């Protein structure tokens with residue numbers, strides 16, 4: 001059955017994916033999400049502002065039934081790459097009948113001097129070579145803001161069998177992370193060059209790439 | 216949902232404490248939003264269902280927001296927690312229509328032995344004043360672990376360890392990074408990544424790393 005929701009809906013406002021802001025070929029988005037919307041008063045009205053000035057290009061998604069008999073209602077505003085990076089503030093305003101006033105939320109990029117990531121690749125431990133799979137390692141560090149993207153490639157083709165860590169606040173107020181790519185030991189032993197690819201605003205052309213292979 | 220009354224939060228012990236026998240692990244039961252009007256709080260502590268006493272409860276402390284906070288701390292037997300015994304805090308108070316019960320215990324699932332490998336700095340980094348010594352730990356379960364860096368029997372200062380990340384096989388890995396001055400590296404001192412996990416012989420293993 002439906003819960004009581006005495007407080008009405010609530011808003012959450014997410015930023016663009018870091019890759020999207022950085023590659024001009026891609027489409028960056030802010031995403032305003034309203035939850036705890038009732039069946040009785042399910043209309044949500046959205047107003048979007050950039051640095052105070054209103055914009056109308058938002059896309060209006062259909063509402064979605066959740067497991068608790070409330071609606072999840074989203075508006076999505078595409079944005080320009082330079083604006084976000086320049087730190088324009090993106091304000092979502094939400095108006096629903098079950099509230100006494102509109103709820104406003106804002107999101108900009110983190111403030112603070114951006115810092116270039118230093119990218120280092122590290123081969124497998126001597127002790128891991130007994131295993132059938134090995135761990136190739138990419139360390140990204142001394143970067144700010146935390147917004148970053150990392151993938152792997154070999155010989156022109158993407159390698160997808162990796163996991164990257166969340167960024168970690170280092171002790172000089174920069175961030176670091178480790179990505180780890182698991183590959184078959186043969187592909188390593190054959191002499192194939194794998195590559196860490198890192199994307200971040202402080203990097204030249206938002207892109208750098210370190211390679212790594214048997215020696 | 217329970218609306219209008221004190222609230223209860225139950226905390227597990229530090230992993231490092233559950234593992235080493237020299238240390239004393241504790242389950243901590245915090246009660247907040249206790250009024251001055253009804254400030255008396257009764258703690259009942261159950262193990263697997265068996266009521267237990269010997270929990271050391273501290274006197275209530277006045278909070279900035281003018282509520283009271285109260286804490287009861289159960290000491291736990293290292294073995295008990297690992298064998299996975301359930302721990303229960305029952306909080307009674309007049310303001311509460313019915314008393315509040317919380318339970319916690321070690322995460323369920325088959326324990327799995329971490330592997331630990333140490334990675335010297337990348338050649339590229341040998342340019343810098345400081346450098347990164349990297350300890351990769353993976354294949355472990357549950358996610359509760361403890362990782363430290365050492366040299367000459369003493370803990371190293373400037374290191375940071377990522378949170379556990381869930382690998383594709385249902386195990387976790389992390390990475391721990393130690394920073395040092397290059398000189399210490401090249402004069403070829405020795406550094407040690409220590410790891411404490413439930414599923415290692417003596418809940419401990421360490422691996423060294425030195426210039427070569």
Ligand SMILES: *[C@@H]1O[C@H](CO)[C@@H](O[C@@H]2O[C@H](CO)[C@@H](O[C@@H]3O[C@H](CO[C@H]4O[C@H](CO)[C@@H](O)[C@H](O)[C@@H]4O[C@@H]4O[C@H](CO)[C@@H](O[C@@H]5O[C@H](CO)[C@H](O)[C@H](O)[C@H]5O)[C@H](O)[C@H]4NC(C)=O)[C@@H](O)[C@H](O[C@H]4O[C@H](CO)[C@@H](O)[C@H](O)[C@@H]4O[C@@H]4O[C@H](CO)[C@@H](O)[C@H](O)[C@H]4NC(C)=O)[C@@H]3O)[C@H](O)[C@H]2NC(C)=O)[C@H](O)[C@H]1NC(C)=O
Nearest residue numbers: 224226227228229232240241242243245247248278280282
């Ligand atoms: C008046 O003022 C009061 C104080 O200012 C204020 O009290 C606060 O009320 C908050 C709620 O209203 C309460 O918020 C909870 O916070 C939980 C996390 O608390 C820890 O982390 C905080 C920092 O982030 C610390 O400040 C806290 O003190 C606490 O820190 C931990 O403390 C323990 C014990 O002290 C300690 O463990 C012990 O360590 C020692 C070492 O000395 C020993 O080794 C012992 O062995 C060991 O036990 C920890 O080290 C320490 N951790 C630190 C410092 O990091 C948070 O978990 C709660 O969130 C959950 O529940 C809410 C429901 O409210 C959910 O909305 C939320 O999503 C979380 O939900 C849970 O998630 C689980 C995991 O995902 C999930 O499995 C569960 O299903 C789910 N539900 C649960 C568990 O029910 C919550 O936010 C805050 O702690 C209170 N502050 C204090 C100091 O108690 C009060 O509100 C004010 N009142 C008014 C009216 O204004």
Ligand SMILES: *[C@@H]1O[C@H](CO)[C@@H](O[C@@H]2O[C@H](CO)[C@@H](O[C@@H]3O[C@H](CO[C@H]4O[C@H](CO)[C@@H](O)[C@H](O)[C@@H]4O[C@@H]4O[C@H](CO)[C@@H](O)[C@H](O)[C@H]4NC(C)=O)[C@@H](O)[C@H](O[C@H]4O[C@H](CO)[C@@H](O)[C@H](O)[C@@H]4O[C@@H]4O[C@H](CO)[C@@H](O)[C@H](O)[C@H]4NC(C)=O)[C@@H]3O)[C@H](O)[C@H]2NC(C)=O)[C@H](O)[C@H]1NC(C)=O
Nearest residue numbers: 003010011012014015031033035036066067068069070072
């Ligand atoms: C009924 O049913 C509903 C369906 O489940 C349920 O909805 C859920 O409601 C909760 C709130 O109760 C809401 O939780 C919030 O989640 C935020 C993160 O959401 C992410 O990640 C989760 C999983 O991690 C996803 O499921 C979400 O969908 C969302 O995914 C992102 O979505 C966007 C848009 O699609 C994508 O672009 C992203 O890629 C995608 N991410 C991922 C990983 O997939 C979380 O941030 C919120 O926490 C903050 O507010 C809390 C308030 O409850 C604070 O306690 C908490 O501290 C956080 O505070 C913030 O802290 C920041 C950093 O520390 C600060 O910078 C901020 O200033 C500060 N902000 C605030 C507001 O405090 C929050 O936990 C779920 O998102 C939501 N489910 C969905 C699907 O949206 C209803 O609640 C149910 N209700 C009832 C009554 O039963």
Ligand SMILES: [Cl-]
Nearest residue numbers: 225226227228
């Ligand atoms: Cl905790």
